[PDB]
């Protein structure tokens, strides 16, 4: 693994989901909105503390170069399981263990992604490796842990 053009482009796409006003920086407001869409309700202090730990220029916001350094870095001890599990719960709103097309579309709309029916269907098809029409927790993990 080495940093590639393709990865930088994926990282820019992820940055843009946070930078909702498209001004080139992620504020505490923008970070909190995405976290709430993904099943958390961070305190004001947690938000400022997360941003400060990647803001060497001290403007209280995250720019792309700092975001990119963060996402590329070789990093080990992370609460990735916790985060993926909470995300799964916000998709699986009825708690039946499976994410439906409708549930998927609901969350994607909340993240700012107005998916077409073709896109929703393709998303379900890519994740539905066991072929049952719906995305279980194990399938979700595979899609969320792809490098």
């Amino acid at each position: 693994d080495q940093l590639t053009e393709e990865q930088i482009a994926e990282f820019k796409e992820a940055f843009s989901l946070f930078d909702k006003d498209g001004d080139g920086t992620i504020t505490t407001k923008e970070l909190g909105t995405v976290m709430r869409s993904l099943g958390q309700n961070p305190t004001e202090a947690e938000l400022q503390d997360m941003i400060n730990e990647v803001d060497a220029d001290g403007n209280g916001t995250i720019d792309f170069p700092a975001f990119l350094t963060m996402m590329a870095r070789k990093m080990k001890d992370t609460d990735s399981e916790e985060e993926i599990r909470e995300a799964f719960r916000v998709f699986d709103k009825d708690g039946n263990g499976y994410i439906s097309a409708a549930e998927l579309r609901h969350v994607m709309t909340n993240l700012g992604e107005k998916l077409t029916d073709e896109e929703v269907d393709e998303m379900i098809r890519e994740a539905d490796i066991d072929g049952d029409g719906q995305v279980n927790y194990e399938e979700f993990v595979q899609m969320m842990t792809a490098k």
Partner: peptide
């Protein structure tokens, strides 16, 4: 994998910012 990758990277970003 484009839309799944974006969503995953968003969850990854939140996880790393929290840990770091």
């Amino acid at each position: 994998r484009r839309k799944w990758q974006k969503t995953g990277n968003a969850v990854r970003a939140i996880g790393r910012l929290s840990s770091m």
